[PDB]
């Protein structure tokens, strides 16, 4: 009542990474550096099309009042049952070979179902993911590569099979399985604060 704030504008495109068509694959997760805007997270919260919203940073009610340096939005597709692997700490296959979170990750992990859009009549063999690697992954590091993997013994000089397995494997999304085996589209919103001035945070409400 005592204070006034300027007219709202410049709502940066969260839809461009949410309502978009394709989310690439987990082994090549994109990275959108959203900055210089005023993102109204409320709509991303108050919606019935989002399944899991288990945040790990700040309470998802004041997030529209904390201004950070910039917010990184990652996006990819995963098996249904693995939606709980993105959480910090928990290990598995995609956790330590395709995507990992740091110990003190301070963002949020949106996920939702897309079985009606990412599976053709007989299923799509288009979404790849990693299943082998030399060792685990440090937080937030892509691993785009194709070099052949060796598990038992002997090298793999541009060969395949018998301890030269192809590092990437397809999912095989058949639109006739249970939820656990259906394609979930997942987005990770990681806030970042830095000595540089902040420029991204929710709108300041207005009144007469």
């Amino acid at each position: 009542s005592i204070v006034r704030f300027p007219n709202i504008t410049n709502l940066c495109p969260f839809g461009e990474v949410f309502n978009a068509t394709r989310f690439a694959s987990v082994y090549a997760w994109n990275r959108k550096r959203i900055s210089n805007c005023v993102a109204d997270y409320s709509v991303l919260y108050n919606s019935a099309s989002f399944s899991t919203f288990k945040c790990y940073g700040v309470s998802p009610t004041k997030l529209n009042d904390l201004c950070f340096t910039n917010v990184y939005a990652d996006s990819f597709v995963i098996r249904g049952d693995e939606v709980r692997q993105i959480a910090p700490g928990q290990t598995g296959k995609i956790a330590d070979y395709n995507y990992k979170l740091p110990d003190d990750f301070t963002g949020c992990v949106i996920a939702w179902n897309s079985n009606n859009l990412d599976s053709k009549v007989g299923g799509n063999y288009n979404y790849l993911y990693r299943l082998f690697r030399k060792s685990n992954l440090k937080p937030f590091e892509r691993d785009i590569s194709t070099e052949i993997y060796q598990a038992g013994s002997t090298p793999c000089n541009g060969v395949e099979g018998f301890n030269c397995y192809f590092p990437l494997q397809s999912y095989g999304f058949q639109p006739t399985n249970g939820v656990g085996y259906q394609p979930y589209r997942v987005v990770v919103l990681s806030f970042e604060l830095l000595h540089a001035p902040a420029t991204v945070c929710g709108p300041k409400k207005s009144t007469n």
Partner: antibody, heavy 125, light 107 residues
Framework: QVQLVESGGGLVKPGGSLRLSCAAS????????MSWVRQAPGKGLEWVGRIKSKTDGGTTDYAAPVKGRFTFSRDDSKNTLYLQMSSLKTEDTALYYC????????????????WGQGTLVTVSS | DIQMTQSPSSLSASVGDRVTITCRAS??????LNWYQQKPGKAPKFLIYAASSLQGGVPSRFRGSGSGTDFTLTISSLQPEDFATYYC?????????FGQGTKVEIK
């Protein structure tokens, strides 16, 4: 790349001690097993024996046809395989091969790729 | 112990036919087995594992298959120089076994 060689053969009377050394050149020795096989002339190859790895003490998986005649030892220091035989026999005049054996990960079916050149054993009084 | 049968000791015919070789065993082994190739004057090499997937550098003409205790290795429109002795081999995951193959004779 990957290489394998054998040596230590000879032409001796039955009874004399004999050593066969198979040397593996430049793939790995300490993280894989190793096997020995027989290939008699004008005949199909036959099992001889394999041993385990990682200096666990050895499994001494001696083959049935040559039970209680030969012994195996993986010298990890020099990364080689030593096969010792004492009582030679005429029926044992067969080619000898050393090979790499280790089961896969996905299917888990043992097989023996990357075979050696072979060592010829001959006995004639 | 383990035993197996390798009746097809010699099977060759006009070049370009659908040659095949059988491998039968009395006991149960599942998919723990392999097939090798040996050309004259050279040590045998590694071609087929698990009776399903070939090995790198092997033309896809070779085709192994089967189940349980009976398996077969065939070839469609066999290529030149394929003539060689093909050996069958089995593993029980503890015990080992080989089998006499076929010495394809040029005719």
């Amino acid at each position: 790349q990957v290489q394998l060689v054998e040596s230590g053969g000879g032409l001796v009377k039955p009874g004399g001690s004999l050593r066969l050394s198979c040397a593996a050149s430049g793939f790995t020795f300490n993280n894989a097993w190793m096997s020995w096989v027989r290939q008699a002339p004008g005949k199909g190859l036959e099992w001889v024996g394999r041993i385990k790895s990682k200096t666990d003490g050895g499994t001494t998986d001696y083959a049935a046809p040559v039970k209680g005649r030969f012994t195996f030892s993986r010298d990890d220091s020099k990364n080689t395989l030593y096969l010792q035989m004492s009582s030679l026999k005429t029926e044992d005049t067969a080619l000898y091969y050393c090979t790499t054996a280790d089961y896969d990960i996905l299917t888990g079916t043992p097989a023996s790729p990357y075979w050696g050149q072979g060592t010829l054993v001959t006995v004639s009084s | 112990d383990i035993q197996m049968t390798q009746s097809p000791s010699s099977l060759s015919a006009s070049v370009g036919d659908r040659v095949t070789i059988t491998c039968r065993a009395s006991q149960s082994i599942t998919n723990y087995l392999n097939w090798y190739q040996q050309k004259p004057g050279k040590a045998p090499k590694f071609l087929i594992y698990a009776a399903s997937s070939l090995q790198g550098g092997v033309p896809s003409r070779f085709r192994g298959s089967g189940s349980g205790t009976d398996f077969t290795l065939t070839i469609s429109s066999l290529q030149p120089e394929d003539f060689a002795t093909y050996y069958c081999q089995q593993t029980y995951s503890t015990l080992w076994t080989f089998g006499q193959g076929t010495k394809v004779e040029i005719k």
